[PDB]
Design a protein around this ligand. Structure first.
Ligand code: F9F
Ligand code: F9F
Ligand code: PLP
Ligand code: PLP
Ligand code: TRP
Ligand code: TRP
Ligand code: CS
Ligand code: CS
Ligand code: CS
Ligand code: CS
Ligand code: CS
Ligand code: CS
Lengths: 268, 390, 390, 268
């Protein structure tokens, strides 16, 4: 499929950036997570980035560590995540869906089989957080065989060789890291380096989404103004889940308000 | 792109987030440079000799083998400063940190021995040391936690995941992924992403080099086998390295069997796990059917980790080394036997290696065999554990 | 009648019941014979090297002395098997026992280190070891008591008198006075009746011999002073012996000051007791006005004895050695300072010696001085004591 | 004075051996100890051996260790012991009185001064348990200057040189040890070696008293028959004190019975 390509073409025609929330699948339970995701979409999410709970999420700070923990407390497994993904896609045919994976969950039981399942349920991209471009060959090859975009990360310090590799190897979107360290709203990153955003375009990279530390509408607006195609926010969204665990209706209301405000910032 | 091969056959690699690749490349370059620098080598040798106490003795143990055709030597890493082999490689890694211009050290620890080793090297060499330790391990290891703090190290409990060693490993890498410009990650075993399995082997290989010289001096020939316990793999690869090309010399690694392999309560991924990707490496591990990292178990905290370094997985695959397991009860018997018959209190980790050598002897008592066990540490730390059981 | 002089000036002698004189004469004769026997010497040297780990390192401690004109080395008896210097002389005494044809060992212990050393030597060398320990000390030293039992030694609590070290000394001699035909009394320090002060010095003198060779190698000259703590006197006389005839080399012994000399709660008989006769010797001791043996005190159990070996009293009398004291608090500060600045955890006993060297430096920081402290043991055993105070 | 010489001459004229009990001075208190000693004498003790409580009695087994402990619990000091000794002598002018001392109590505050005090209160002998003949010179010289007999020990294994020394150096009586080890009724010794008893007489030694482990009348009779001038018993006597602490009247009755029986055995 061409879900990201279609999305970015539509947004470009409207001079608009993408706003892409991250949540952990099955946090705080399967049913509530499905409602959360429908709320994100209804509030204006252009695409989704969805984490499969993993025992050892080494690129995530405490907020997302705790989301993984909540999902495990609810008994969430990767098989249940794929059932959720199929349902989400059946409700929402055009929204791009990206997974945030750790390598063992992809490799476990066969890399090719993992990407085949992604294709079956209608996932559009997979970002394997602990596979750098240097180790990426079997992942990116399997992704492409199954019509899945492999997503790669461009650090703010990326040298020319790395930019060329990310531009060549990735598809769908290019993940532009706002800073070093791990996920977290508590740590704000930098503005996209115009050198990076411009080199990526020079090398015909997939459109850039900036992520890590994006928690306010002003940062969304700023990312787009710097030349990124959009912005991803995770911890800020997951914190609303965490704060409102005891109040599921209030949780959805606050998620709706927050996403609406973040999406509004991406408009020209 | 790297200077050295990051793989041992299919095992190893650099499975870290992209943001950490420059840190690994920088460390690899500094290591390659240091290995060719006679001044670095002389500094390292001086610390090993005058601070740590190398060379360590090779002790013939006649009482234990009486009435058999086994001759057994123990390589006495228990006599190294700190009471275990870990001191060797922390000194070398601290010197690499300084070579790179870094002022801070991050380390993970489970049993606490690596945390203590890191803290002592950092105290000596003017580095600011912070140590991650799973909260469950902090609770179990008050003596080591207090030692780390006496040495000036910051000990940071880790409450995420299972609050144990793998969780401390994750947290050390999380920290490093934001702090690499000023901090070196002092990984505690011959595992993790390249270049750590290589660096740790090279900074432990004096164990086997000395053993070779000492056994040639005493016996006029190489051992029939060298035997070492395997937690993450450092003391065993340090003993094995200099013998890998001596094809007659058996290499035997001993994983913890815990309550018995059949119970699933063990720490023997090399022979009983399956290949996965975790902690920066492709290696055998204990994992659930759907690929979550499992809980390991051993009476000995130093062996209690659900994976193993990639060079051991490789040496097993090609048949150069053989790997076996020893249960808690077998390790306890070996501990008691060495105390009573040789007056040496061995670490419970090392007692796994000794227990396997004792089995080699007892099963085939008329087999001629010259064995070396790597006695990786002293067992003062274990006397209450052993007390509370007996 | 004896082969060797039982006195050091006025101090020493053989103040035992008549029934024990043949045992002392037999031991003296066996020692004199052993000292001329190259086979005995080679056996002893082999155990020291291959079992105990000699020679021990001499470590330069630069961080502690930064900004002063003191150069400080530590003689690393903490790295000896067992974790203290006591191992040297128990190995030699076990070989004397075997030379005499004896199959059993009796030993006294207070802190428990000598009991452990005796038990390990007996385990190694096929001797049946029984250890007397005052009941109050048994209560305080569970870890060491368990080590002794793991090694196969019988630990016999002593409930008479003050139920502490002097009472265990008495009981060991009571036993020996009936069992000398088959048992050797492995006295734990350079004190007691002749020939023990002499034997223990000679079986510890490698400390100073090695120190001399090592300092000449590193500095090209002898130390300005060597500094050692004094419990009964063994580690200090072992360090001092080879320097006695090097008249330029200061010999400084450090007695425990406890809560302060003025409090009377100390273990500093050499400078603050008066001459008496007890434990087979004429020596300074802590005693009541009418001559009952007093209770000593130190934070460190290894220094906590109301007397001292006669050779130290003699070296003091002629001015060849100087003796000073260090309080509990001063020892604790030195312990913390070495941990944090050198990554070495010293025994609290040894910390008294280190504390005095630190005072020598700090009081006169522009005085040029090359100092060696005998680091008699490691301080793992003390971490809770230090913890419970801080 | 010549108290031992006079005693042994009188006993020889009656073909009789000496029976000599040992007790610790001030066990279990000063007043009771004085009554105990008067009872021993009235029951037929020929001489006394009296211990001054010491912190570290290394030639004594548990029975006598415990006697020392009881005396210390009553606050007994050497000065109080000398007050007791003066009183005992004032009541009983001819009975030989021997002290059992440890070296530090004699040396503490001056060897000469110690033996001068012994002479002042009328003590006849001093046995310093932890001073072998080899170390004895200043003790024996001070004893003799103050008309005190220094007592020395002859082990059952004594060689000729030692027998000659004990014969030459000692006065009053020669202490013949029945066995190695320490004091105690729980451990019976041997019969005096006829070689030892005869060599001592050949060398003109002071008359021999056998001690250690003597607890029955038959052993007293046997010691005398073997050629000893008598026998000493301590632990057996002190055990009667220990057993009857709560019954001071019964204690004296049992001491009287026991001493009478032991003394009866020494008669020809
Ligand atoms: O808003 P924040 O700070 O919580 O950031 C949320 C990011 N969520 S995500 O799935 O895009 C995401 C993307 C990349 C990650 O790691 C990697 F860069 F190493 F690959 C981890 C998470
Ligand atoms: O009857 P027992 O077994 O209690 O023996 C009692 C002996 N009492 S004593 O004062 O004569 C006595 C004599 C000598 C002693 O020791 C020495 F030989 F080393 F000098 C100790 C006590
Ligand atoms: C930590 C430890 C081990 C296990 O670690 P490896 O890296 O496998 O050597 C073994 N022995 C001792 C004494 C230890 O402290
Ligand atoms: C026992 C002990 C001492 C004191 O004994 P000395 O005979 O005076 O040496 C000193 N240091 C250590 C570590 C000890 O164990
Ligand atoms: N748990 C042991 C050894 C260790 C340190 N880091 C490790 C990583 C993997 C396996 C074992 C280890 C210690 O901390 O001393
Ligand atoms: N108390 C210490 C040292 C010691 C043994 N015996 C002694 C006799 C006197 C003085 C000290 C000691 C120990 O047992 O290890
Ligand atoms: Cs905008
Ligand atoms: Cs053998
Ligand atoms: Cs393991
Ligand atoms: Cs200096
Ligand atoms: Cs002392
Ligand atoms: Cs009779």
């Amino acid at each position: 499929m061409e879900r990201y390509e279609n999305l970015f073409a539509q947004l470009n025609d409207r001079r608009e950036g993408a706003f892409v929330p991250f949540v952990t699948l099955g946090d705080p339970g399967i049913e509530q997570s499905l409602k959360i995701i429908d709320t994100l979409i209804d509030a204006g999410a252009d695409a989704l980035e969805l984490g499969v709970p993993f025992s050892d999420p080494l690129a995530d700070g405490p907020t997302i560590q705790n989301a993984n923990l909540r999902a495990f407390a609810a008994g969430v497994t990767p098989a249940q995540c794929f059932e959720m993904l199929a349902l989400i896609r059946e409700k929402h045919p055009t929204i791009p869906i990206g997974l945030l994976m750790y390598a063992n969950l992809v490799f476990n039981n066969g890399i090719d089989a993992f990407y085949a399942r992604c294709e079956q349920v209608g996932v559009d991209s997979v970002l394997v957080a602990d596979v750098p471009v240097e180790e990426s060959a079997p992942f990116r090859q399997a992704a492409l065989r199954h019509n899945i975009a492999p997503i790669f990360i461009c650090p703010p310090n990326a040298d020319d060789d790395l930019l060329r590799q990310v531009a060549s190897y990735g598809r769908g979107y290019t993940y532009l890291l706002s800073r070093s360290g791990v996920t977290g709203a508590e740590n704000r990153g930098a503005l996209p380096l115009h050198h990076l955003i411009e080199k990526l375009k020079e090398y015909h990279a997939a459109p850039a989404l900036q992520g890590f530390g994006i928690s306010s509408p002003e940062q969304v607006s700023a990312a787009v103004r710097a030349g990124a195609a959009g912005a991803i926010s995770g911890s800020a969204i997951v914190k609303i889940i965490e704060k409102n665990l005891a109040s599921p209706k209030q949780m959805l209301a606050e998620l709706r308000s927050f996403v609406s405000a973040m999406k509004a910032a991406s408009r020209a | 792109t790297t200077l050295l091969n990051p793989y041992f056959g299919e095992f190893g690699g650099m499975y870290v987030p992209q943001i950490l690749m420059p840190a690994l490349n920088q460390l690899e370059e500094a290591f390659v440079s240091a290995q060719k620098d006679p001044e670095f080598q002389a500094q390292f040798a001086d610390l090993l000799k005058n601070y740590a106490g190398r060379p360590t003795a090779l002790t013939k143990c006649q009482n234990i083998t009486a009435g058999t055709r086994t001759t057994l030597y123990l390589k006495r890493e228990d006599l190294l400063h700190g009471g275990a082999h870990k001191t060797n490689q922390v000194l070398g890694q601290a010197l690499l940190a300084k070579r790179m211009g870094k002022s801070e050290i991050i380390a993970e620890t489970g049993a606490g021995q690596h945390g203590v080793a890191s803290a002592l090297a950092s105290a000596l060499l003017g580095l600011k040391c912070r140590i991650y330790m799973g909260a469950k391990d902090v609770e179990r290891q008050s003596p080591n936690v207090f030692r780390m703090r006496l040495m000036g190290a910051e000990v940071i409990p880790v409450h995420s995941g299972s609050a144990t060693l793998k969780d401390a490993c994750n947290e050390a890498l999380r920290d490093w992924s934001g702090s690499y410009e000023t901090a070196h990650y002092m990984l505690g075993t011959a595992a993790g992403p390249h270049p750590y399995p290589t660096i740790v082997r090279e900074f432990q290989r004096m164990i086997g080099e000395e053993t070779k010289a000492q056994i040639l001096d005493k016996e006029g020939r190489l051992p029939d086998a060298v035997i070492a316990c395997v937690g993450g793999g450092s003391n065993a690869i340090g003993m094995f390295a200099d013998f890998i090309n001596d094809t007659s010399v058996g290499l035997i690694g001993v994983e913890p069997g815990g309550h018995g392999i059949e119970t699933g309560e063990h720490g023997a991924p090399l022979k009983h796990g399956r290949v996965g990707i975790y902690f920066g490496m492709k290696a055998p591990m204990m994992q659930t059917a759907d690929g979550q990292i499992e809980e390991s178990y051993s009476i000995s905290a130093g062996l209690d980790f659900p994976s193993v370094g990639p060079q051991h997985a490789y040496l097993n695959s090609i048949g150069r080394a053989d790997y076996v397991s020893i249960t808690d009860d077998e390790a306890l018997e070996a501990f008691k036997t060495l105390c009573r018959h040789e007056g040496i209190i061995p670490a419970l980790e090392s007692s796994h290696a000794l227990a396997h050598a004792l089995k080699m002897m007892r099963e085939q008592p008329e087999k001629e065999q010259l064995l070396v066990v790597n006695l990786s540490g002293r067992g003062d730390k274990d006397i209450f554990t052993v007390h509370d059981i007996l």
